[PDB]
């Protein structure tokens, strides 16, 4: 059976999402025959507790020059990261020439604020097209993967870092031991690694299975991160819940013994215990709920198609690949998906090949129903689409359950 990527012990599988494409490999017609697939399934290490995918997707297939996710296409997320820059600038710098490092800086949504404040900084972004965005904003960015050797080389040329930050990146990286070897080389004396990622507790509580796909190798919790930190000579010393991306936790890891864990760490552990997050049974109940959501969503879409309604998807999310492929949802059930990201438009969604169109197509004419794939952005979207609702249009949500609004 599978072996844990953190500790090497045995992983018990609890959800099999079947054959899946790369979530962010939007296709032209020419690409469909060559299309990569893998088996997506999730399990729990019985030793260390880390919840993780069973099949590692090679990193160069996911992250590469044409990687299509631009972080700065959301107002809520631009403002989130401006506040992140402030937090780090306020609490994690010392001395005359402090140094902020980000792993997975993308289009520079966070570091651009660090730069504008005059603080020395460096991002690692192996996806060149978004890295060019970051650079166009004044950000220093190496087009390379953060791992032990690259971090260690930066330590020599740039000196110690006050903080290494990563958002929606650390869970994308199976090779955590290399990353933390790199952090141990690169951080200064009072340095920390601060990372925020989709939280297992929220996923389980919301039945948000679409948070499970190729780029989410780990579904972190405080318990698993605490064990992982200790294994690599680090220590979980602070936790913070965040509402973005469906529910996340931001973890702060110091070298072991360097800092006093905050009371927040124990509080979140107790939440996990109240949730039963570390019982496989809870995880099995999750998997049954995932199956109910699939049946109810497919039955709803099938009925709306039978009635001759028009259904269109809203937001070509990476997440949505898990939904379409696990649920068997093709162009017969959802005619196209509207998305604001220019590089996603005029292409086909992974595996199930829904056409992606610009947002403007949503109004020409308005559909009867919009399937909200970008449900983590619901208020922004439902707010602005007033003409849709005035014409009687309805929203279909499937988190935390299938429902029509």
Ligand X SMILES: Cc1cn([C@H]2C[C@H](O)[C@@H](COP(=O)(O)OP(=O)(O)O[C@@H]3C[C@](C)(N)C(=O)[C@@H](C)O3)O2)c(=O)[nH]c1=O
Q: Any idea what DSSP says for residue 58?
A: P
Instruction: Mark out the alpha helices in 18-70 (DSSP H runs).
Output: 59-62
Region binding Cl ion by CB under 5 A among candidate stretches 98-106, 189-197, 240-248, 285-293:
285-293
Residue 332 Cβ vs Zn ion, minimum distance, rounded to whole Å: 42
Query: Which residues have CB under 8 Å from 71's CB, separation 6+?
Result: 77, 81, 106, 107, 109, 130
* Residue 4 touching Zn ion (CB under 5 A): yes
Q: Quick check: 154 binds ligand SAH (CB under 6 A)?
A: no
Q: Which does 63 bind (CB under 5 to 8 A by kind): Zn ion, Cl ion, ligand SAH, none?
A: ligand SAH
- The distance of closest approach from Cβ of residue 341 to ligand SAH in the complex, given in angstroms and rounded to an integer, is 13
Residue 106 binds which of ligand SAH, Cl ion, Zn ion, none (CB < 5-8 A, kind-dependent): ligand SAH
> CB-wise, 162 or 339, nearer to ligand X?
339
Torsion, CA 235, CA 241, CA 243, CA 247, rounded to 10: 60
Distances from the Cα of 123 to the Cα of 95, 105, 194, 249, 345, angstroms: 20, 6, 14, 22, 28
CA distances from 334 to 361, 388, 402 (A): 14, 17, 16
Neighbours of 1 (CB within 10 A): 8
Shortest distance (Å) from residue 347 CB to a second copy: 29
- Strand-pair category, 394-397 with 403-404: antiparallel
Candidate residues 15, 41, 48, 323; the one interacting with Zn ion per rule CB under 5 A: 48
How far apart CA 346 and CA 356 sit, in angstroms, is 6
Of 65-73, 187-195, 273-281, 373-381: span binding ligand SAH (CB under 6 A): 65-73
Nearer to ligand X, 258 or 359 (CB): 359
Indicate whether 164 belongs to the interface with ligand X (CB under 6 A). no
- Residue from 8, 9, 12, 16 touching Cl ion (CB under 5 A): that is 16
Of 5, 398, 15, 7, nearest to 200 (Cα)? 15
Which does residue 249 bind out of Zn ion, ligand SAH, Cl ion, none, counting CB within 5 to 8 angstroms by kind?
A: none
For ligand X (CB under 6 A), the number of binding residues is 23
Q: How far apart are CA 222 and CA 319, in angstroms?
A: 23
Binding mask 90-119 for a second copy (x = CB under 8 A): xx-xxxx----------------x---xxx
Q: Which is nearer to Zn ion, 48 or 269 (CB)?
A: 48
- Chosen residue from 35, 174, 378, 400 binding a second copy by CB under 8 A: 378
- List the one residue from 15, 57, 167, 337 that touches ligand SAH (CB under 6 A): 167
Torsion-angle region of 108 (φ positive above 0: left; ψ -120 to 50: alpha; else: beta): left
* First-to-final CA distance of the chain: 43
Count of chain residues binding a second copy (CB under 8 A): 30
Sequence-ordered list of residues with C-beta below 8 angstroms from that of 384, at least 6 positions apart, any chain: none
Least distance CB 216 / Cl ion (angstroms): 17
16 makes contact, choosing from Zn ion, ligand X, Cl ion, none, with CB < 5 to 8 Å by partner type, with Cl ion
| 75 part of the interface to a second copy, by CB under 8 A | yes
Among 89, 153, 264, 359, binds a second copy (CB under 8 A): 89
Contact assessment for residue 77 and residue 244, using Cβ atoms and an 8 Å cutoff = yes
- Cβ-Cβ contacts under 8 Å for 380 (sequence gap 6 or more): 74, 75, 76
Toward ligand SAH, which CB reaches closer, 67 or 213? Answer: 67
Helical segments of 97-175, H only: 111-116, 128-136, 148-158
**How many angstroms separate the CA atoms of 96 and 94, rounded?**
7
Residues belonging to the binding site for Zn(2+) are: 4, 7, 45, 48
CA distance 296 to 397: 11
Nearest to 158 by CA among 110, 98, 96, 89: 98
Q: How far is CA 389 from the centre of its chain?
A: 30
Our finding on whether 267 is near a second copy (CB under 8 A) is no
- Residues that bind Zn ion in the complex, under the rule CB under 5 A: 4, 6-7, 9, 45, 47-48, 50
- Residues that bind ligand X in the complex, under the rule CB under 6 A: 69, 73-74, 168, 215, 245, 315-319, 338-341, 344, 359, 374, 376-377, 380-381, 384
- Residues that bind a second copy in the complex, under the rule CB under 8 A: 75-76, 79, 82-83, 85-91, 93-96, 113, 117-119, 378-384, 386, 389-390
- Residues that bind ligand SAH in the complex, under the rule CB under 6 A: 63, 67, 69, 71, 77, 103-104, 106, 124-127, 130, 145-147, 167-169, 172-173
């Amino acid at each position: 059976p599978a072996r844990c990527r953190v500790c090497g012990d045995t992983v018990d599988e609890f959800l099999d999402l079947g054959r899946q494409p790369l979530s962010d490999r939007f296709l032209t017609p020419a690409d469909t025959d060559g299309e990569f697939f893998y088996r997506l399934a999730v399990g729990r290490c019985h030793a260390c507790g880390m919840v993780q995918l069973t099949e590692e997707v090679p990193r160069h297939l996911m992250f590469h020059e044409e990687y299509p996710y631009h972080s700065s296409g959301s107002s809520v997320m631009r403002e989130h990261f401006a506040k992140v820059a402030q937090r780090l600038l306020a609490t994690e710098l010392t001395g005359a020439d402090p140094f902020v490092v980000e792993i997975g800086c993308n289009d520079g949504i966070m570091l651009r604020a660090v730069h504008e404040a005059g603080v020395r900084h460096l991002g690692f972004e192996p996806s060149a097209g978004v890295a060019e965005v970051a650079r166009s904003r004044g950000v220093r960015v190496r087009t390379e993967f953060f791992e032990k050797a690259t971090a260690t080389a930066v330590r020599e040329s740039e000196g110690p870092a006050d903080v290494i930050y990563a958002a929606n990146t650390m869970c994308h990286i199976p090779y955590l031991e290399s990353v933390f070897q790199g952090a141990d080389a690169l951080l200064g004396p009072d340095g920390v690694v601060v990372f925020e990622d989709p939280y297992l507790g929220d996923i389980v509580a919301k039945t948000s299975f679409d948070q499970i796909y190729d780029e989410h190798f780990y579904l972190f919790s405080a318990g698993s991160v605490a064990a992982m930190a200790e294994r690599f000579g680090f220590e979980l010393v602070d936790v913070e819940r965040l509402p973005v991306h469906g529910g996340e936790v931001r973890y702060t890891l110091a070298r072991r013994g360097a800092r006093t864990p905050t009371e927040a760490v124990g509080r979140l552990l107790a939440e996990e215990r109240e949730q039963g997050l570390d019982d496989l049974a809870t995880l099995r109940t999750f998997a049954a709920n995932v199956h109910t959501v699939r049946d109810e969503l497919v039955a709803l879409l099938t009925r709306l198609r039978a009635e001759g309604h028009r259904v269109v998807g809203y937001g070509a999310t990476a997440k949505s690949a898990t939904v379409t492929n696990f649920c068997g949802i093709g162009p017969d059930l959802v005619s196209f998906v509207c998305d604001t990201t220019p590089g996603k438009q005029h292409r086909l969604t992974p595996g199930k090949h829904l056409p992606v169109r610009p947002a403007e197509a949503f109004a020409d004419p308005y559909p009867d129903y919009a399937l909200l794939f970008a449900w983590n952005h619901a208020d922004e979207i439902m707010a602005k689409e007033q003409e849709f609702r005035q014409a009687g249009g309805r929203w279909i949500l499937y988190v935390p359950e299938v429902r029509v609004l």
